[PDB]
Amino acid sequence: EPVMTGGPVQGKALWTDYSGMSKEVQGPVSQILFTQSPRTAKGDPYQNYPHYIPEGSRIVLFDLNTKELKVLTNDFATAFDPCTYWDGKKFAFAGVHKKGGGCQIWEMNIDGSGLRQMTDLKGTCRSPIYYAAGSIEEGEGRIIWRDREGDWKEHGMVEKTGMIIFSGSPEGVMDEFHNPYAYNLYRLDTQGGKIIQRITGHVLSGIEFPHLNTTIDQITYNLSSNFDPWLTPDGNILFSSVQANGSRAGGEGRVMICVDNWDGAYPRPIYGNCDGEIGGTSGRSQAKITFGDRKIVYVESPYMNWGVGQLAAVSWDAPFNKTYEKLTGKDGGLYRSPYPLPDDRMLVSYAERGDFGIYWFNFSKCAAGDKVYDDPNWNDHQPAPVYVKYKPRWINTFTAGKNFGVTVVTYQPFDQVKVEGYPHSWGTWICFDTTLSDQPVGPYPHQKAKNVSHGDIKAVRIIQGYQCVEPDSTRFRVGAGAHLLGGERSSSNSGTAFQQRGIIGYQYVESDGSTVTSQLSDVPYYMQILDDKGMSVQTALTWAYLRPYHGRICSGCHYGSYRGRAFKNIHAKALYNWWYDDRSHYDSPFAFRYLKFDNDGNYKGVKHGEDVVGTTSQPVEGLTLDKQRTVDFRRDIQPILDAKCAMCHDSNNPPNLGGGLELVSVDGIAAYSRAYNSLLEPQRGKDPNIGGKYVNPSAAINSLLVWRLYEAELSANAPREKIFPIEGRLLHNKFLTQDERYAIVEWIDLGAQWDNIPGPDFYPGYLV
Amino acid sequence: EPVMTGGPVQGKALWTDYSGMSKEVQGPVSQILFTQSPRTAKGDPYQNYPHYIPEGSRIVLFDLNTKELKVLTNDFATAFDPCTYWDGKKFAFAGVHKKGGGCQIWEMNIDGSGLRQMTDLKGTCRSPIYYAAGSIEEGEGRIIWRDEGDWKEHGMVEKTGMIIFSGSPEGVMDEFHNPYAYNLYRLDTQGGKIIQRITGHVLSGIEFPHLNTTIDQITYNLSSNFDPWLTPDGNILFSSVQANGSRAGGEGRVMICVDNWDGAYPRPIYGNCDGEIGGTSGRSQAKITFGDRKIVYVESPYMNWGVGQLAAVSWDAPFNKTYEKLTGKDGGLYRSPYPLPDDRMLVSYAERGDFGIYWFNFSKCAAGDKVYDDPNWNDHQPAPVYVKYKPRWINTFTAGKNFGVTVVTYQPFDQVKVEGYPHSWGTWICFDTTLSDQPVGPYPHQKAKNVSHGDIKAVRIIQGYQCVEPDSTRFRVGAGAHLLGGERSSSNSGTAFQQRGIIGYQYVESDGSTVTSQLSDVPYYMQILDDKGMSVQTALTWAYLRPYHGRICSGCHYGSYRGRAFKNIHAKALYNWWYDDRSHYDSPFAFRYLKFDNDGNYKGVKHGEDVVGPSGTTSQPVEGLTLDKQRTVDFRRDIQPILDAKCAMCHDSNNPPNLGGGLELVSVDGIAAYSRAYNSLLEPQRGKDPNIGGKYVNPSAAINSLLVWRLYEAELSANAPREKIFPIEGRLLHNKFLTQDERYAIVEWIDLGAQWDNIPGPDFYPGYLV
Ligand code: HEC
Ligand code: HEC
Ligand code: HEC
Ligand code: HEC
Ligand SMILES: [Ca+2]
Ligand SMILES: [Ca+2]
Ligand SMILES: [Ca+2]
Ligand SMILES: [Ca+2]
Ligand SMILES: [Cl-]
Ligand SMILES: [Cl-]
Ligand SMILES: [Zn+2]
Ligand SMILES: [Zn+2]
Incomplete structure (x- = not known):
């Protein structure tokens, strides 16, 4: 059926319509996959979400007809987060084997054979999904590249299995709530870098796992956890992000539903992070999108770290308050892990009093419908039905992973560090009006301390956040500043909710309010607009990140260009300061280390530091991590x-x-x-x-x-x-x-x- | 041990120290009472709290040693809310008899004998508690009254006590349009003779002759008041839903508060004010610890839920600095906490969702060893048996409905049937109406502008009308969802404000002091007015006066009734209140209309048509006591x-x-x-x-x-x-x-x-x- 657009015939859908083609390609559902968890605080630690390692859990296959159940994970100590492949003949999951190795990403055939380990990481891995990049049709694709100044030629072939997007956390780190985990999104080459080689012409840069024939690359740099990735109808990655930065959102923070590219080139908010929106401090997790009415349906938990709760929905096409719904929606129990089917049905995990099972959802009655399967001795959740998944469109990637960019002219992969000689990966960003905002004048740091017009904003301060890492347990204490402004989120390092930070550098702003700069890549950062005394008028509280060689544009300062509003047509001076030279990747000035003032202490200019080190026409400054200044x-x-x-x-x-x-x-x-x-x-x-x-x-x-x-x-x-x-x-x-x-x-x-x-x-x- | 004060001997407590005496008078606990409910939405409807009728539930007695269990309530289809008597040989509860009668208040002995029916009310009743009023030591007690007159003994009455319970009528809607509105009732168990012992007249209210009981309504809130308990100083601790209009982001709040057992002096304790912790979380089943004197309550994620986590705030100083989180790190759900004088506590806990009875552990901030957990039942509301010390009983100046008690000779009187008043009435006075802790802001509970003495000319007094819509074809909820009201709107209004009318207007003195006489036993609130007759600040809440009672406040939400001591203020209104010995009150009644000058500025106040057996017991004209004629727009x-x-x-x-x-x-x-x-x-x-x-x-x-x-x-x-x-x-x-x-x-x-x-x-x- 046609959904987003009309098709070739009446009642038929165009191949460009993801929802409709998903409806047509689904097929009858017979068997389903789902997770059974021990009923314990340790067996179902949904209070520690996103960090969820339901120790003792298993993944099972159930037949809706013969009612026969089979345990596929018996060789695993713990198994969870099932996600089926496109054909439905195999699936990927997270778990820890009895042989050890930690919680990792695995994949296995639907019959229970052909087990493969996709990840060996120091840390914990979770919630894998398949993203078909360069693989739409089953078979082998060809690898082609340029002769380094020669022609373009064919070298070899690769089986097209696509990629795997998952959420994972390193070892011995702390988030902004001082929880001992920080999660971020990774893209994974299933063929060992040769998929990325097929798409780009160079193998994936990142951490290589040659023994597993895989390679991973970190696409999201948020200092807090990004978790539960899924697929958008337009071919991007939908997930949940924790925005905890400093004292924002009443010193609490929010869990927002947002999307990003599979390489992490363009993160943007969908719903939940902005003032005036619905749900407050409620946790938002396990989001998926309906095929018929195109609804983003997610678990809204009363507690920010909870994975169980109610079910809520907002329109994907228009994610605003007007389209917000509370699906279930009252009596009297808990819901988790919803799974919308292309035929408009839905599978939910429901507990009436206290124990979860797989249930069909009823939209007319706004609650759980007929029962699928419940064992009393197990908590039954994460239903994953077996059917044929239509592949969403894969977007072109201009990065080969860590340190690697891909030029816009010849489309040739290049290493910014090993080859070009830069101390670190570096991207650029540009704001067309820094004075343009939807925020009022107010006392809170994300608001304007005073009215500012064009010319009033002289420069911008760019700040890099530092992950909180404290190996010595005797020298660090949480809550040391509870009597100070920080409260519960304070620590030995700070009496505020703000964790450790440093200054990436200062950049001047044009008289029209526009600014553009070059700076470090693959690091968490944000900015502040500055008046003629060099003080922050308004702070952007969030963690931005740039992939190597990537530029990022925005119309204004939280103006809506990345949220609910169209880009404003603006002719900006900064545009001409960006890339004007044939011999350069970027001609934009790098962030300066200091500022210079007059007698009174008013802003005069920007001043170079001693960190200054032919692919750019400007002095390269502030790319050395060891030299980065802080106060x-x-x-x-x-x-x-x-x-x-x-x-x-x-x-x-x-x-x-x-x-x-x-x-x-x-x-x-x-x-x-x-x-x-x-x-x-x-x-x-x-x-x-x-x-x-x-x-x-x-x-x-x-x-x-x-x-x-x-x-x-x-x-x-x-x-x-x-x-x-x-x-x-x-x-x-x-x-x-x-x-x-x-x-x-x-x-x-x-x-x-x-x-x-x-x-x-x-x-x-x-x-x- | 001594707690609040010191004792006569080191290690012993004075009889004035309640929490101190309770530790000694308790005794060993070998047995506990608790409620078992079926695990179902209809078997354990905690999502509809306070309106909670766990159909198919039984009350049971369990021995902690012999591990024996016995069902007392087998005659009841539905039974819940156990509360033990002082000696521990009997208890009261809420139940639905297998022969019908609805959900009412009952009591029976611990052995299962002696079943008696307390309430015949048309409606629902639950959470009964014993309040010992004129009953401290066991026995019988005297009934004395006065007829030129003397004070004579007219005979005796068994001293048992009173029963404070929560109850709601039927065909009634709260401010959320739920089909219930709860309030608090005091109940004379002897048929009014205990009230007659204390006051000198039987309780006025609804009488239950065949049950030999009498009920009086002490709380008039338009939303649900529930879960009553005892304060260490002898008042009633409970939960109150303040939903009035668009209050608190339009969603209102559920606050822990206290009131006298006659409902003379309700005041907030924690959770109703800006800056306080918990937001829209529900606060229910509040009880107080004996050792450290902490109010321990169930904090539910949702406003309507009866299950949740455990929170605590010190009773002595209920502020944010004493707030703490007792639970939540196991992800389990807690309900029905029961502190012991031994500094122990019994909690109902479902880790992964089967509720059971557990000993609480304060060192682990979570549930401890298991007491009794049946996989087939939600096991909650634990009520251990032991001897409970009796709290102080406060003197009541009302005999109940229409009945006041004189402050001079202490003689009960009926304002309506005898004196000839259209309705029972009372008074209230504010010393400074311009005095507030609230800033200037857009929200209605704040100031619309700076006001000094003289800027506030008068006050508007408004009575909330309960929403009653028997015919479902004439009423619809959410008719104004496109308007300001949202889902809380209805066929009646496009806003969150339900139907209401004008009690009347009263002038304000040049120093900001005001005092008035008005209707009693009805919900109301006030608005301070400028010289154009418009509200600068609105008090969003529901206030109620008992007959002949009167209530003072330092300022307009100044904190005299919350966290601050009364400011010493010499007010002009104090001399307009009662100056005559032949009168109950000399304060003016709320005027119906206003008078303006040619500029449209406030000239003054104006009498209406409702002016009135009647006797000479007040100096001022009687206005606004006829409910029939009360004006609204x-x-x-x-x-x-x-x-x-x-x-x-x-x-x-x-x-x-x-x-x-x-x-x-x-x-x-x-x-x-x-x-x-x-x-x-x-x-x-x-x-x-x-x-x-x-x-x-x-x-x-x-x-x-x-x-x-x-x-x-x-x-x-x-x-x-x-x-x-x-x-x-x-x-x-x-x-x-x-x-x-x-x-x-x-x-x-x-x-x-x-x-x-x-x-x-x-x-x-x-x-x-x-
Ligand atoms: C070193 C540069 C400092 C800093 C950071 C501050 N002081 Fe002073 N101070 C002095 C006196 C007599 C006063 C009170 C009179 C007045 O405020 O004009 C102050 C006050 C302050 C404040 C304000 C505190 C408040 O109002 O609550 C602050 C924040 C402050 N100071 C910081 C005297 C001296 C002095 C000579 C004895 C010198 C030297 C300093 N101050 C230095 C500093
Ligand atoms: C013809 C003589 C009119 C009569 C009778 C009423 N109104 Fe009016 N109104 C009229 C005009 C030409 C305008 C244009 C704007 C202006 O300020 O003159 C208005 C405007 C209003 C507004 C403001 C609307 C806005 O700014 O969004 C209001 C609130 C309004 N009018 C209300 C109003 C009321 C209550 C009337 C009965 C007393 C009334 N109007 C009569 C013309 C005329
Ligand atoms: C002025 C400071 C800026 C400029 C120059 C940019 N942004 Fe935006 N940003 C800003 C504010 C006040 C906030 C919200 C702070 C809070 O506590 O709520 C944000 C937040 C974001 C987010 C998070 C999602 C959201 O709130 O919408 C993203 C994503 C984001 N900012 C991206 C972004 C981009 C692409 C910009 C172009 C260079 C940009 N910011 C500039 C204020 C400011
Ligand atoms: C100015 C209007 C007044 C006056 C004359 C009185 N009060 Fe108070 N009150 C007032 C406000 C703005 C609020 C809060 C409204 C909101 O939160 O939206 C209150 C609240 C109460 C409460 C509820 C508990 C609390 O908020 O502390 C009670 C109970 C209460 N007020 C009682 C009360 C008494 C005894 C007064 C003396 C006559 C009184 N009010 C006067 C503002 C105002
Ligand atoms: Ca189950
Ligand atoms: Ca350090
Ligand atoms: Ca049980
Ligand atoms: Ca009507
Ligand atoms: Cl913008
Ligand atoms: Cl006050
Ligand atoms: Zn925002
Ligand atoms: Zn208040």
Whole structure:
């Protein structure tokens, strides 16, 4: 049947219509695959989602007719997350074998034979899916490349099995909630790099598994978990992303439904991350799309880390509030792992009182319909019916994986590091108007601290987030700053919800508000727009990432060009600063290490660092990771306070800046110094996520401390009712030089941390 | 051991310390009572909480040593909510007899004998508890009263106690349009003779002669009040649903609060205010620990759920700083916690979904060793047997319905049947109406502008009408889903505000103090008004006065009833309250109308037609006690004709808003409820929270409404409805189109919540019909 578009004949669908062709190619459903889990907190740890390793679980095949059940995973200690192939004769899953090796990705035929290990990783792997890239039809494709200046010739063939997109986490890392996992999406070459060689002309760059004949490449760099990938009708990857960055979303964060390319070139939000939307802090997981009405249907859990909950839906074509539905939707139990069929039916895992089973869903009654299978001794979930899957279109990839770009002219793969000689992979990004936003003027860091027009935004600060890695368990403590702004998300490293960060660099902004820059690739980052004093007016709280050689465009600053609105037609100066030279990949300037000011401390220009190192016409700066600058309170700030402040500020004259770097014990926890505790102290009647008495994290322009150091009213948000005292006033603007003052500014805009150097270091801190 | 205070001997507690005495008076526990429910949506309907009737459930007794189990309730088809007596030889519960009668309150001995029926109520009853009032030590007690007069003993009554339970009538809808509205009832077990012992007159209320019991309604909330329990100082701890109008993001909140056993002084404890933890989470089954004095309650993910995690806040200082999460790291579901004087606790727990009884572990922040878990039953509501210490009983100044008790001679009196008043009445006073912890903001529970003393001229007093729609062809839920109300709208209104009317207006003194006499035993709230007669701030909640009672507050949500001590204030209203010895109260009754000057500014207050056996027990004219004659603003009867006369001529489809078409219903998404003008005026605006307002209308703030802004042709508040308000080109002055009465009729309509059908039940005025 036609769905998205009309077909060749009445009642028939065009091959371009994914939904319709899926309807026509489905066929009768007889057998289904699903996961049976032990009923235990350890057997069904859905409270630890996305990190879900239902130890003791198995994958089973059930016949809807003969009612006979077969266990396919008997050789596995744990097995889960089944996903069938296109033909339905084989399927991929996640699990750990009895022989050991950890939780990995495997695939096996539907009859139970032909087992193969797709991943050997240090970490845990989950939820594999098949993405057919360069394989639409069954057979062998041909590999062709250029002679390096010769012609294009054929070399060899490859069986077309496509790729595998999965979610996985490394070993010994912490997310922004300090959970001991960080998940991200990986693309996997099933043929050992030769699929990517067929598509590109070079084998996949990434981590190679020659013993398994596979290769993996990390396509998503988010500092928190990205999980449960699926397929969009237009051939992209649909998944759930945790946006936890700093104090955003009331210091809670949100789990959003979003999509990205299979190489991770174009991540964009679908629903759930933006203010005014529905579900709040609810967890959103296991999202899939209906074929008939094209509905994104997902599990909405009451807790952000829960994998069980209700079922909700939003239109795929129009993911807005107007199309939001709560499917189930009341009485009285729990739902999980929904699976929409092309014939418009649906399979859900339902627990009426407390124990899950496979059930047909009923849309008329808004609840679970007739029963498929339930064992009382098992929790039955993740139904995966056996049928024929129509392959979504595969999108062209301009990256060969790690360090590897593919030119737009000759389409020839190139290594930016090993060959071209760059210290690190580097992409570019461009914003056509930095002043253009849908956000109002407000106290919160993601909003505007003041009205800004074209010319008011002088530059932008680009910041890289650092993963939280703490091998030594004696030198790190979570909740050390609970008395400070951070609360439960604070730690030995920071008294705020902001984890460790560093400055990628500064880039100037044109008089029309446009900006473009070259910077590091495959690293989590975000930006801040700056006024003529070099303070952040507005912060983008999220983790952006660039694949090698990839540019990224946006109309505005959270304007809707990547969310709900069409791109605005804009003729921008930055466009001509991007690529003008024949001999270059990109001619855009790299992020500068410093800024330079005038006498007053107003913005003058950008200043090169000493990190400067023929495929680009501009000085290459800021690609060396070991040289990347940050602002540490102990190394940078505290000495300034000891020199020019502590003398005049003691217990009698608050805030108390004295005592040097000596740690102070609060609630039996010694983490920070006196000055840090004083400056990070909360204020009555003020949201800690906004800031404290003297400090607003990731807004310096809103901070009382900065207000006093400049002795001016900097923003439209007053820190308190009485800022400057009437009598006894003393002007603080002459106490510091521009270097020290702007060092404090940078410290606050970075999130006002304590330890900005990842891992245990020599500088003072928590010890037990 | 001593807890709150010190004892006479080291290691022992004073008799004034409740939590201290309870540790000694408890005794060993060899047996427990608990409820077993079938595992089904209809067998354990916790999703419909508080309205919970676990059909097919039994109450059982279990010995912790001999491991024996016995079914006491076998005569009942449905039985639940166990509560043990003080000695532990008997208990009370909610049950459905196999012979019928509905779900009522019952009590029986621990052995299974002595079955007695407490409630015949037409409706549902559950969660009964014992409150010992005039009963501390076992025995009989005296009944004394006065006839020139003396105080004579008229004989005795068994001292047993009172029963506080939750109950709801039938054919009734709450603010969420659920088919139940619960409240709290006090019950005399001796047939009114215990109330006669305390007050000197039998309890007035609904009488149950054949059961020898009497009931009185102590809580008038339009939404459900449930799960009553005991405070260490002798009050009633329970859960309250505050849903009123668009309150709290339009979804309302479920708060833990306390009230006197006669319902004289309800006050919030935790969960109802901005900044507090838990949001829209349900808070139910709240109990208090003896050792560290912690309120421990079930925090449900969903507002209507009776299962969830376990949360706690200190009873002594119920604030965010004492808040903590007791559970949740195992992913299991908890319900029905029961703290012990031994600093132990019994919890109902389903790890992977079979609910059972478990000993709680505080060191693990989760459930401990198993007590009894049957795979075939949800095992919950554990109620261990032991001797319970009795909380203090507070003096009641009301004998129940229509009955007050004099503060001078302490003599019960009937305000209606005897004194000749149309309805029972009471008083309330605020010392400063301009005093608040709330900032200036767009939301109706905040200030629309800064107000000082003298800026607040008067106050509007509004009575909430319960939603009763027996005929299903005349009423539809979600008729206004395209409007501001959303799914909480109905055939009655396009907003979340249900039907209500005007109790009346009362002037405010120059210092911000106000006091008034008004109806009692009815739900109501107040609005402070500026010199144009518009609400600056609305109190969104449901307040109720017992007969002859009166209630004081320092300020307007200043925190005198929440987290702050009363501010010392010498108020002008204090001298307008009771100055005469021959009167109960000398304070003025709520006036029906207003008087304005030629400028439209507040001149004063005006008497209505309802003025009234009657006796000389008050100095002021009696106004607004007739429920029949209580005035409200209805859009069809009042506003629409004004719109047709003065408006619709220039407003058609080509000139928004479209006010034409008369009262003819407009079908929207297959539902025809309201007219064209109503649909137009209640239309939402892009980028604006509908909980605040729409294009032309902000419910329960007229001063924030663009329509009113234009009708007065001025900027009324500090919250602008939109960026472009007054056109610079082709503008037309709208201020002289209406008289003062019409314009202020619109103002009143908007301040009331901008309803459509304000007349409860099906009427002759145009509306939804199938
Ligand atoms: C080193 C550059 C610093 C910093 C960072 C601060 N001070 Fe001072 N200070 C002094 C006096 C007499 C006052 C009170 C009078 C007035 O505020 O004008 C202050 C006040 C502050 C504040 C404001 C605190 C508040 O209002 O709550 C802040 C944030 C602050 N200081 C920071 C005196 C001196 C002084 C001479 C004795 C010197 C040197 C400093 N201060 C240095 C610093
Ligand atoms: C013809 C003399 C009119 C009468 C009778 C009424 N209105 Fe009117 N209205 C009229 C015009 C020409 C305009 C254009 C805009 C302007 O401000 O002049 C309006 C506008 C309004 C508006 C503002 C709509 C908006 O800005 O979105 C409102 C709220 C409005 N009119 C309401 C209104 C009411 C309540 C009337 C009866 C008292 C009424 N109008 C009569 C012309 C005429
Ligand atoms: C001004 C700062 C910018 C600029 C220059 C860019 N973005 Fe966007 N961004 C911005 C804000 C205020 C937010 C939301 C912060 C919060 O706490 O909610 C975001 C967020 C994103 C996201 C997350 C999804 C979403 O919120 O819509 C993505 C994805 C994203 N930003 C991408 C993006 C792109 C492609 C840009 C072009 C270079 C870009 N940002 C620039 C503000 C700003
Ligand atoms: C100005 C209007 C008043 C006055 C004259 C009184 N109160 Fe209070 N009240 C008020 C607001 C704005 C709110 C919160 C509304 C909301 O959250 O949407 C309340 C709330 C209450 C409550 C509910 C519990 C709580 O919020 O603390 C109770 C109970 C209560 N108010 C009682 C009360 C009493 C005893 C008063 C003395 C006459 C009183 N109110 C006056 C604002 C106002
Ligand atoms: Ca099952
Ligand atoms: Ca460190
Ligand atoms: Ca059980
Ligand atoms: Ca009616
Ligand atoms: Cl944008
Ligand atoms: Cl108050
Ligand atoms: Zn957003
Ligand atoms: Zn409140």
